[PDB]
Amino acid sequence: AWEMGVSDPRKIVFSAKIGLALTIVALLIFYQEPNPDLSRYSVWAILTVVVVFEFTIGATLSKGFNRALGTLSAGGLALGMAELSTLFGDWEEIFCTLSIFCIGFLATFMKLYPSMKAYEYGFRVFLLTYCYILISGFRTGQFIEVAISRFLLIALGAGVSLGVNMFIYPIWAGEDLHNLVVKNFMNVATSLEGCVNGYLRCVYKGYRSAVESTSQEESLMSFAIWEPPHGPYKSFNYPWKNYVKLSGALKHCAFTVMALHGCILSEIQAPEERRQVFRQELQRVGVEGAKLLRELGEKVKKMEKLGPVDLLFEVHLAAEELQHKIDKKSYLLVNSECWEKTYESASALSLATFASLLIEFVARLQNVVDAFKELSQKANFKEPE
Amino acid sequence: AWEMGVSDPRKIVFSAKIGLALTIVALLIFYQEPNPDLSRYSVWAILTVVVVFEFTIGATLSKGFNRALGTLSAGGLALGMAELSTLFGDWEEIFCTLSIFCIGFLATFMKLYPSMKAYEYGFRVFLLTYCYILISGFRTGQFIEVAISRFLLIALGAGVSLGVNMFIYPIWAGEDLHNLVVKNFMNVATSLEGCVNGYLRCVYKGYRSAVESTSQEESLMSFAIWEPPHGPYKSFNYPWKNYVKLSGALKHCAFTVMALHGCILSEIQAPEERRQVFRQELQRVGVEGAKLLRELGEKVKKMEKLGPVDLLFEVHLAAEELQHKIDKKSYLLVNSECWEKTYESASALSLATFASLLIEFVARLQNVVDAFKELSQKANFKEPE
Ligand SMILES: CCCCCCCCCCCCCCCCCCC(=O)O[C@H](COC(=O)CCCCCCCCCCCCCCCCC)COP(=O)(O)O[C@H]1[C@H](O)[C@@H](O)[C@@H](OP(=O)(O)O)[C@@H](O)[C@H]1O
Ligand SMILES: CCCCCCCCCCCCCCCC(=O)O
Numbered sequence: 224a225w226e227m228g229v230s231d232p233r234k235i236v237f238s239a240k241i242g243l244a245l246t247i248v249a250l251l252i253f254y255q256e257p258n259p260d261l262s263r264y265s266v267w268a269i270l271t272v273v274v275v276f277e278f279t280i281g282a283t284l285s286k287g288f289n290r291a292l293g294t295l296s297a298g299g300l301a302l303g304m305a306e307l308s309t310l311f312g313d314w315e316e317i318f319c320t321l322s323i324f325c326i327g328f329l330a331t332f333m334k335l336y337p338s339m340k341a342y343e344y345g346f347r348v349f350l351l352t353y354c355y356i357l358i359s360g361f362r363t364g365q366f367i368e369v370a371i372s373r374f375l376l377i378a379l380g381a382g383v384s385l386g387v388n389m390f391i392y393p394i395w396a397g398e399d400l401h402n403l404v405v406k407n408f409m410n411v412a413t414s415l416e417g418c419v420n421g422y423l424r425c426v427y428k429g430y431r432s433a434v435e436s437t438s439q440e441e442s443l444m445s446f447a448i449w450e451p452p453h454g455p456y457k458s459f460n461y462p463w464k465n466y467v468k469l470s471g472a473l474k475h476c477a478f479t480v481m482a483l484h485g486c487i488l489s490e491i492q493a494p495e496e497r498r499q500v501f502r503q504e505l506q507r508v509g510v511e512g513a514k515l516l517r518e519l520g521e522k523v524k525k526m527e528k529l530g531p532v533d534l535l536f537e538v539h540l541a542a543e544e545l546q547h548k549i550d551k552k553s554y555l556l557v558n559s560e561c562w563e564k565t566y567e568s569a570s571a572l573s574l575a576t577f578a579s580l581l582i583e584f585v586a587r588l589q590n591v592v593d594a595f596k597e598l599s600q601k602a603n604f605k606e607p608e
Numbered sequence: 609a610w611e612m613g614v615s616d617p618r619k620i621v622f623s624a625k626i627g628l629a630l631t632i633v634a635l636l637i638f639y640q641e642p643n644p645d646l647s648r649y650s651v652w653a654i655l656t657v658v659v660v661f662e663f664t665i666g667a668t669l670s671k672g673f674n675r676a677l678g679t680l681s682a683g684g685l686a687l688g689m690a691e692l693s694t695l696f697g698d699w700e701e702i703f704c705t706l707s708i709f710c711i712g713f714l715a716t717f718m719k720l721y722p723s724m725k726a727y728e729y730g731f732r733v734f735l736l737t738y739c740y741i742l743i744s745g746f747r748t749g750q751f752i753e754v755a756i757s758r759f760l761l762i763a764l765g766a767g768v769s770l771g772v773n774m775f776i777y778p779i780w781a782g783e784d785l786h787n788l789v790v791k792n793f794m795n796v797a798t799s800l801e802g803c804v805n806g807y808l809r810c811v812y813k814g815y816r817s818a819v820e821s822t823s824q825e826e827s828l829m830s831f832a833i834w835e836p837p838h839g840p841y842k843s844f845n846y847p848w849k850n851y852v853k854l855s856g857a858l859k860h861c862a863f864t865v866m867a868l869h870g871c872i873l874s875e876i877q878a879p880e881e882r883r884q885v886f887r888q889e890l891q892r893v894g895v896e897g898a899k900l901l902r903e904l905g906e907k908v909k910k911m912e913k914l915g916p917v918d919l920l921f922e923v924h925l926a927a928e929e930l931q932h933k934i935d936k937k938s939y940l941l942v943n944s945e946c947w948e949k950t951y952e953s954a955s956a957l958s959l960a961t962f963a964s965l966l967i968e969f970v971a972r973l974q975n976v977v978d979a980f981k982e983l984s985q986k987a988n989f990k991e992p993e
């Protein structure tokens with residue numbers, strides 16, 4: 224509560240902004256000219272305020288657009304059907320209930336398509352609007368004024384919500400994707416160091432977050448294309464997709480770290496005295512990889528180009544040293560007596576797996592640098608000092 | 609559309625059930641005994657059906673409970689504050705709009721906790737009810753008479769929805785958990801066979817679904833605790849948690865299959881002619897593993913206990929034969945000339961990784977059998993024919 228608000232003060236301004244918009248609309252309702260008609264449906268502007276206030280600008284715009292589409296299409300259909308029903312003078316309510324059944328069937332079937340799972344909020348407003356408009360206009364006609372009057376209040380509430388959200392300490396979604404990339408870049412290096420240290424002893428959140436955030440970064444990329452230029456991101460079509468390409472290149476590397484972590488939890492393990500022979504070569508690779516990943520993260524954070532010096536020299540040298548060391552002592556991994564128990568042989572063979580997975584990670588490192596170079600070319604990154 | 613319906617005929621009955629409930633409510637609203645007030649709020653009963661109709665019984669029962677909690681607490685608070693406001697006679701609107709501000713702030717702050725992410729639908733009902741009751745009773749008193757009528761309409765709509773859902777071809781969430789476990793059991797075996805065949809060539813959906821459905825198996829289990837006894841599951845407290853334990857035991861095995869699939873996409877790979885030496889031993893393990901997993905899935909499906917014979921004899925024998933074969937021809941994995949380039953050495957060493965991962969999978973198989981035995985003990989499974 225108090226602790227969570229203290230740690231993140233972004234969540235205490237949003238609640239106050241929502242309260243401020245609600246207070247504004249409440250005052251505008253309470254202090255108004257005594258017009259008898261609207262006081263029976265003036266409660267709609269505050270429900271619109273409650274329903275259309277979202278955390279980010281891009282989400283607000285995109286979901287308001289979808290809700291408006293649904294409302295307007297449902298209203299058009301309801302008006303058309305109500306106009307048509309008059310022909311069947313003897314059976315008007317029968318026709319209305321038969322239209323309600325069919326529309327409810329169709330609207331419920333079309334929302335169960337798996338590819339429309341993220342738009343379930345826009346299929347509810349369609350059915351609500353159709354049913355409300357059809358049932359509320361049956362008596363005494365009055366179909367076309369039970370729509371304009373209740374749509375103008377919705378417009379007013381949406382305008383108030385948009386103004387308050389957009390003109391007072393706004394939160395953007397592109398700066399959230401920009402920060403998420405940097406966080407993943409640091410988590411992966413922490414995980415790698417932890418795994419190597421744990422194996423060499425006499426880790427999970429990092430690669431888990433680096434391998435389980437594809438949908439978060441895609442929702443964030445779908446919210447960031449609605450927002451206008453601001454701050455450092457001065458351009459009409461900012462390439463938000465190259466960030467996702469870099470994230471995928473990094474996740475491909477994180478898979479190997481996940482396999483290395485799985486190596487520790489294995490039922491079959493190698494003796495300690497055999498592990499201790501390769502300590503320094505195994506540790507140097509992890510040190511160099513962590514340094515490279517942190518350097519790439521810092522360069523991404525400040526929007527800077529790569530320098531002239533090669534970044535993969537040291538880790539490649541360490542990997543070649545590791546290969547030479549493995550070649551020199553390969554007689555500890557296999558047994559030559561049987562050349563032409565089983566648990567001991569499996570334990571002896573289980574160390575080559577760890578070494579080969581480390582070498583595979585080092586080999587995979589280069590796609591990330593290629594993707595970073597492409598992204599820094601697409602967006603105008605500053606020349607390094 | 610039509611293809612989706614023909615593939616899955618369960619989605620054509622849900623859509624007709626919703627339509628039928630809507631039609632019933634519409635008929636009751638269109639053929640009602642003339643009433644002065646009730647006729648102006650009849651529409652409140654046809655939107656409840658839209659809002660509370662869910663795919664499964666338990667979800668409908670868990671979410672209606674929470675929605676009722678939110679609505680009742682909001683109504684109580686609104687009535688209390690309306691009674692309280694009378695003391696400040698000079699400034700009534702100011703007090704009302706200040707309590708609106710405070711309630712909006714607190715309700716927005718309490719829903720941003722990370723542990724209340726799945727209950728966002730109940731924090732909206734609270735604010736909507738509070739604001740509606742406060743704003744609708746300001747003129748002409750009438751605070752305790754605008755609640756009972758609309759809550760009777762809400763109750764009627766919810767009752768119609770519940771009756772239609774529970775008395776016409778219901779869908780249960782425990783038969784969905786029970787089906788999901790069997791599906792994972794078959795997907796994993798298909799993935800394993802595909803991976804082995806692909807590596808020996810001269811796989812993704814299986815382990816992907818077996819490793820990414822933990823939340824589905826927890827949501828279905830939280831829905832299935834509300835449902836009364838029915839069909840084969842005759843008991844007051846059915847052990848739905850042993851299914852989750854078995855699923856986790858299977859996921860621990862699926863991790864190594866994912867690693868084996870990853871070994872195929874590596875940058876460093878071994879020559880084909882050297883792989884071909886171990887073909888039969890590599891294929892026998894996959895065949896036996898697939899057969900065992902399919903046997904376990906079939907026995908889970910029919911709710912039957914394991915027989916007296918040991919199910920892990922053949923796979924253990926195949927693993928031992930593979931280990932002997934590797935021990936006999938170990939000189940193709942290392943190079944002894946250097947005993948005291950790197951690309952070819954890494955390629956040669958990359959095959960021991962595959963063999964060791966296969967042996968680790970065989971080693972991990974036994975916890976799944978332990979979990980199955982425990983589950984078949986906890987629930988009364990039929991003795992084998
Ligand atoms: C012949 C014709 C030819 C064509 C010509 C053109 C003619 C077309 C004319 C078009 C005019 C049509 C306008 C018709 C007005 C009728 C609207 C009725 C309606 O919209 O229906 C009810 C109504 O309710 C009420 O009281 C009012 C509540 C307000 C609704 C606002 C919804 C959003 C509107 C669209 C988007 C706006 C923004 C657009 C951008 C604009 C920028 C300026 C909906 O309710 P709701 O959305 O608030 O839903 C609740 C639910 O009620 C809870 O219970 C919760 O439940 P839970 O999920 O459990 O938390 C949640 O679900 C929660 O969403
Ligand atoms: C806009 C006015 C109509 C609103 C209709 C949707 C209201 C959603 C609230 C659901 C409350 C469900 C309470 C269950 C009642 C019960 O049977 O005990």
Ligand SMILES: CCCCCCCCCCCCCCCC(=O)O
Nearest residue numbers: 679680683684736737740755758759
């Ligand atoms: C937008 C409309 C939301 C639905 C709110 C309709 C009112 C239903 C809830 C009123 C229940 C009030 C009961 C309070 C009795 C008490 O606990 O003292």
